[PDB]
Amino acid sequence: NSIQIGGLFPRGADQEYSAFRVGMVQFSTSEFRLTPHIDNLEVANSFAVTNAFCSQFSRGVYAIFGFYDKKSVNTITSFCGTLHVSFITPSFPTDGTHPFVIQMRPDLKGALLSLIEYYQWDKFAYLYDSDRGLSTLQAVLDSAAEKKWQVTAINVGNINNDKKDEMYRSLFQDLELKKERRVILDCERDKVNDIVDQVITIGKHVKGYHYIIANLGFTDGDLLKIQFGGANVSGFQIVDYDDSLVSKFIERWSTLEEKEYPGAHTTTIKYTSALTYDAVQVMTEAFRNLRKQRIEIGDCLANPAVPWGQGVEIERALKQVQVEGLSGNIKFDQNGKRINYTINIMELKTNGPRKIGYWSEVDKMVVT
């Protein structure tokens, strides 16, 4: 009795798709199996996302796993909400009410604000990507008013890859001389290197800097292979490689064939890929729970809109799932947001990245 689902993957999301496939093997059974229909697309393109979503809807899927970005998130939220089709995603979470969107990614804003306070910063630069979210900007600016921080918030987004050389010159002119060496990096991975390299290049107090990397994958990729030149570096991690569940997963992931599973055959996994694997567990558990409870379960532009009648039952089952995964304890509130999770707080130290503590909604920051 195969369960039809959609998968909407950004082009080039190879490791995430490998993790998706490993999840299907691990969490599938002899009798029950998810049957995915995969669309690879440019998620920044709302026409493309709309077309993929509607195609999946017309096929008759029971849920869609996928990604969105800043430009397409409203298409996903509006179509899911209108048609009662559940969308499970590792993409950035949103604060608004969004029925039918299950957000695997824990919110990071609270942990970031707690870390700023932990280091007792009161003056710092916030370098963010216009090509990324803005919920974190807002939160930082709003906290600055309350906490009396002096924030220099520079949208490092939309760089012509041309004037780049000198959009950094004016950037560091403001910082370097204002003797502002506490810096939060909230952008795409590549722009991190591009900014850090600009600090060592114009060699000045290179080691006097302290960077906070505002993402959930501090130790992902060769991120920490950069030449920070003795500067302090801190960040966040949702995948704890010392946890029993993660260690067992890596025992397998580390042995996989690269040809079959691009991005595997390593001892680490990107947090987005980990969340993708966890999403498969969540979906499998939801459908298994519908079976236990004996709950039996086509035109996108049809007018009037015909929402899926059973949609609410699947949405409910998904949000009621409680399991442990690669991203720790997984539990959802009624709006599809992660709750009762933990984010590990990391510092780059003499012998490599080290966990110095953790953050939860209830307790805020706890030092190990």
Ligand X SMILES: *[C@@H]1O[C@H](CO)[C@@H](O)[C@H](O)[C@H]1NC(C)=O
Which of its own copies, ligand X, none is residue 339 near (CB under 5 to 8 Å by kind)? ligand X
339 contacts ligand X (rule: CB under 6 A)? yes
Q: How many CB atoms lie within 10 A of CB 77?
A: 19
Which of its own copies, ligand X, none is residue 40 near (CB under 5 to 8 Å by kind)? none
313 contacts ligand X (rule: CB under 6 A)? no
- Are 125 and 185 a contacting pair, CB within 8 Å? no
- Closest CB to its own copies among 35 and 170? 170
Nearest to 103 by CA among 68, 79, 127: 68
- Closest CB to ligand X among 299 and 363? 363
Sole binder of ligand X in the list 55, 99, 340, 355 (CB under 6 A)? 340
Which of ligand X, its own copies, none is residue 340 near (CB under 5 to 8 Å by kind)? ligand X
- Are 109 and 337 a contacting pair, CB within 8 Å? no
CB of 363 to ligand X, least distance (A): 8
By CB under 6 A, the count of residues binding ligand X is 4
List, in sequence order, the alpha helices (H) in the chain.
Answer: 14-27, 46-59, 73-83, 109-118, 135-147, 164-167, 169-177, 189-201, 244-253, 271-292, 311-319
Alpha carbon distance 249, 247 (integer Å): 5
Residue 151: CA atoms inside 13 Å, Cβ hemisphere, count? 23
- Are 332 and 321 a contacting pair, CB within 8 Å? yes
Which of ligand X, its own copies, none is residue 362 near (CB under 5 to 8 Å by kind)? ligand X
Q: What phi and psi, each to the nearest 5 degrees, are found at residue 10?
A: -65, 145
Give the single-character DSSP code of 340: S
4 contacts ligand X (rule: CB under 6 A)? no
Alpha carbon distance 74, 64 (integer Å): 16
- Are 121 and 295 a contacting pair, CB within 8 Å? no
Which of ligand X, its own copies, none is residue 361 near (CB under 5 to 8 Å by kind)? ligand X
324 contacts ligand X (rule: CB under 6 A)? no
- Closest CB to ligand X among 110 and 157? 110
Site residues (CB under 8 A) for its own copies?
45-48, 50-51, 54-55, 71-72, 74-75, 77-79, 81-83, 95, 130, 134, 138, 141-142, 144-146, 150, 152-155, 158, 170, 174, 300-301, 303, 305
Side chain identity at residue 228, one-letter code: F
Give the single-character DSSP code of 132: S
Give the single-character DSSP code of 107: P
- Closest residue to ligand X, judged by C-beta, is 340
- Closest CB to ligand X among 270 and 319? 319
- Closest CB to its own copies among 174 and 258? 174
CB of 147 to ligand X, least distance (A): 22
Alpha carbon distance 30, 125 (integer Å): 54
Sole binder of ligand X in the list 25, 301, 362, 367 (CB under 6 A)? 362
- Closest CB to its own copies among 262 and 298? 298
- Closest CB to ligand X among 94 and 360? 360
361 contacts ligand X (rule: CB under 6 A)? yes
Which of ligand X, its own copies, none is residue 103 near (CB under 5 to 8 Å by kind)? none
What Å distances lie between residue 256 and 53, 253, 271, CA to CA? 32, 6, 18
Structure-block tokens of residue 197? 């390299």
Residues near ligand X (CB under 6 A):
339-340, 361-362
